[PDB]
From Swiss-Prot, chain A:
This is Importin subunit beta-3. InterPro entries: ARM-like, ARM-type_fold, Importin_beta, Importin_rep_4, Importin_rep_5, Importin_rep_6. Keywords: Acetylation, Cytoplasm, Nucleus, Phosphoprotein, Protein transport, Repeat, Transport. Functions in nuclear protein import as nuclear transport receptor. Serves as receptor for classical and arginine/glycine-rich nuclear localization signals (cNLS and rg-NLS) in cargo substrates. Its predominant cargo substrate seems to be ribosomal proteins and ribosome biogenesis trans- and cis-acting factors. Required for nuclear transport of YAP1, NOP1 and SOF1. Mediates the nuclear import of histones H3 and H4. Mediates docking of the importin/substrate complex to the nuclear pore complex (NPC) through binding to repeat-containing nucleoporins. Plays a role in protein secretion. GO terms for biological process: mRNA export from nucleus; protein import into nucleus; regulation of mitotic nuclear division; regulation of protein desumoylation. Present with 15500 molecules/cell in log phase SD medium. Belongs to the importin beta family. Importin beta-3 subfamily. It is found in: Cytoplasm; Nucleus. One of its GO terms (molecular function) is nuclear import signal receptor activity. It comes from Saccharomyces cerevisiae (strain ATCC 204508 / S288c) (Baker's yeast). The keyword Phosphoprotein applies. The modification Phosphothreonine is found at residue 792. Gene3D superfamilies: 6.10.140.1700, Leucine-rich Repeat Variant. It comes from the Eukaryota.
Swiss-Prot record, chain B:
Interacts with mating-type protein ALPHA1. The lineage of its organism: Eukaryota, Fungi, Dikarya, Ascomycota, Saccharomycotina. Phosphorylated by the STE7, STE11 and STE20 kinases. Signal peptide: none annotated. It is found in: Nucleus. This is Protein STE12. The DNA-binding domain seems to be involved in the suppression of pseudohyphae formation under nitrogen-rich conditions and in haploids. This region is also involved in the regulation of budding pattern of haploids. The gene is STE12. The chain holds residues 606 to 617 of 688 of the full protein. Binds to the DNA sequence mediating pheromone induction (called the pheromone response element = PRE) which is found in the upstream control region of several a-, alpha- and haploid-specific genes. Involved in mating of haploids and in pseudohyphae formation in diploids.
Amino acid sequence: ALPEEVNRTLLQIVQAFASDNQIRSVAEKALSEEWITENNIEYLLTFLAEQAAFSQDTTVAALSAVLFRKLALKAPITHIRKEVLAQIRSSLLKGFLSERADSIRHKLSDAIAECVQDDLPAWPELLQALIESLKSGNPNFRESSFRILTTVPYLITAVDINSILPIFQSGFTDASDNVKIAAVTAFVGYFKQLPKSEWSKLGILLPSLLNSLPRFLDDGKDDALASVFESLIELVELAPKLFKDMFDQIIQFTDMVIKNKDLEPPARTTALELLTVFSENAPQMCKSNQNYGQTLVMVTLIMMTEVSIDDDDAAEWIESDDTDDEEEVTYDHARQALDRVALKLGGEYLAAPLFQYLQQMITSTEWRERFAAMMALSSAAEGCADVLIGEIPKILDMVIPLINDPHPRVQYGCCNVLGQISTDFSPFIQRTAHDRILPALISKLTSECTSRVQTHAAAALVNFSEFASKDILEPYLDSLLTNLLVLLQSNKLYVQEQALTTIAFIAEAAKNKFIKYYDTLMPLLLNVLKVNSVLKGKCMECATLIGFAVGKEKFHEHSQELISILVALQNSDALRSYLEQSWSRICRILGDDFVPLLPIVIPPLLITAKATQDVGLIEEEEAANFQQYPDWDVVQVQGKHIAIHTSVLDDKVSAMELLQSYATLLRGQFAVYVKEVMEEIALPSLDFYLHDGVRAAGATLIPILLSCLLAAEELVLLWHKASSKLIGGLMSEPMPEITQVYHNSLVNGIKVMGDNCLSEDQLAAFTKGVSANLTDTYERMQDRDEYNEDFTDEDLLDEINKSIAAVLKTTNGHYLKNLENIWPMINTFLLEPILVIFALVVIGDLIQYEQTASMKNAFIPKVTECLISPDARIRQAASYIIGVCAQYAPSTYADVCIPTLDTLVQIVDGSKLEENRSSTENASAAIAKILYAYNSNIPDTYTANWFKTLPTITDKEAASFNYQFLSQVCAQSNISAVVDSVIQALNERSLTVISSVKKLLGFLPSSDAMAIFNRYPADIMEKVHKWF
Amino acid sequence: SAKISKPLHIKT
């Protein structure tokens, strides 16, 4: 179909691709600069389709198929002439139906798929080819057809339903494993790609798929089973309820696989994953079935015993360092599975089945089962905390006896649990089980025990210490410390390292109680450092945490020598980060005396925090293996593939956070760096579209930088620059969580910069940003079923409220004008609770600045509704609005405020209860506002009602009004309720009303005055003396 | 990690 000249030019080029730099680079330029142009592109696509279809050379065929796939997207296929699309399609199809190597048929299939499209003409020859190939006796034809149905799931819609059903059923049951896997993959891909409204049309095939599964175990084809479990895992995340009717059968099947422990791990790990993922996607369904929980606990307990296989003494485990053995695959998987399901389902549902088994495993003569027991509890404790936090003596009764098990791995197991639960049941467990936990861990520290066990116990003392007060640790310190010094003398590096960190963290919790241990510890530490990088880092960490615990005066006995060692250490990669945190901690200890060390510490942080977005424009194939590295990720942004060096950008964050924390501590003393950090780090960081941590860390740096310069023209320039990039980010930023940080960052910027810190264009550009943010939140939220059982959004709206309020205040009202343009938006929200709360909160801010009449009619009907809402947050925002009406718009509002006033006397009356103490306090303030505005114009029972709502202890601005009103009830024997109403507010720290009160007590004898405080305990009488 | 903690989740 091509001129013969064109053919050997193109042939030469494509053949040059395999090869030398010269021949191959000349071809590369030729292709990209000469052949992919409006004028040659169709010739090029025609050629490549011909080669892939007909070439007898493997390499040329393959390459052309790949190239065609790549270039056919870019063209794109849509702007190709009809006569040439047709010809390309026809040859691609003839190639597919001819004799090709498997991998070329795969590449042809991928090329064919690029030629099937919404706006492209119908290709009914494809449809026909796929149906016939599916019946071919050649697996490669069957497999390749399902591969095309995977790339282009719309084709499945286009075949008659009575053909496509038997196609998949024959597919699931095919003699070829490869065809099975491709059938499964195409079947699940359909649900991946199509709207839910199309799902019911293949959904009916699920039981045929599930019914095909036992055959994989009959044939002993477990690797193939694993891949099918993988597709099934993706189907659970898309349509868990499709599994409802056969739920027991899948549970029992996964059970059966995992028990067959001659199977290789992949079938067993993916089976477990399939089990696990129901708890994440259909928690009601798992909970409505006692079998799920029982099987899930049983099979993770089986897998947790699979340790030290063929090594009963644990010699290998005893002899190694305190890391995980990465050969213990099923055991690792079982621990994260139990944890994951516990976290989803809660203890109400799993503790019973869990405990049924543990009671029994604790007593086995198989050590593996006694260990399993401890590790299973360790996995489940957090998710089951709601129940287990109450059964804490019972748990210690089981665990603590094992601390002395003959087998050192069971001992390590028990250390593990005491550690895990010191975290998960904190702070309650530190208060109530210190007397059992500490002696138990401390007994393992002795050099009688194995290195692994001493180390594990020392690690568990970090978990305990984290949430133990200095007073609880105090009687245990000398004993803790004398033991850990012995650990410090071990011959094993990892015991020393753990010893050091354990002492550091105990010292952190001990605080000033650690002062007496400083003189024994500090020289031991100095000696280690003067002499094993990690040891030195953990040692400097230990020293500076001891520093922070004992305070600056005591830290001064060794600070200069310690600082000189740091210097030597820094200027000489796990080390880097211990060094930087230690400098940062010295800054917290020394305060302003750190200032002379800034030139040592800051420059290296400047370098790291200037890191650029290190991107590599990359190719499809050349990814995946790039992805292997934990330090790289690849994403698709606009069609193309990009490799981004993630670690480097994480390090840029880390450095930005340290700069941020120096700037926060040093305030005006950091000013010298502000310009440079702002222009070279904070601001360019907002443009880092490939890493959101950077963008957020850039945003939080902004207000802090400004505030440093403030405390020490530029300020105004930088603020203008920074606010404008913040504003601009609001219309472009794709991630809602980042959007939030920008609003918060504006709010904090405004708070720093003060009055009228914004210009008119900025106020207008902010409005558009606020509107686009509101528009996209609406859109995402009007998207939340047959198949299935967002604080992110709530939080973003929370902050938008703050920024609007903040902008209103800095403009001193003038932002009302701009605010008018998004009123339709606001109004839709007002009439789904999160959108409502938002809108009410906005309107309360509006009124704060009688020019709102324009909207009285548009909102009070819904606000009055909201007053009696079942949701406390709605009532709260509602009443605030009614109260603010009478405060700032007294007169354009009365026909409303006085009517509602009875509503408020009722909302006022589970009122005084934690959950809604806040809502009823606003109503209370709201009625006091009405009573003020229209003072002796009111039809007075009211005020005596209002009174019985005192005290106001939770909402501060409410309390502030109520006691202002209280200060404008008299005499009587209301007197002790009058006073206490005030003592309560003060003591609870929610709120000159004192002056008013002392006047009332003036009107009574010596003895009558005194007696009122007679009820108050010593501590609040100390305060009352200092108040009156 | 120099305290007790759980292994990282293995999903996607």
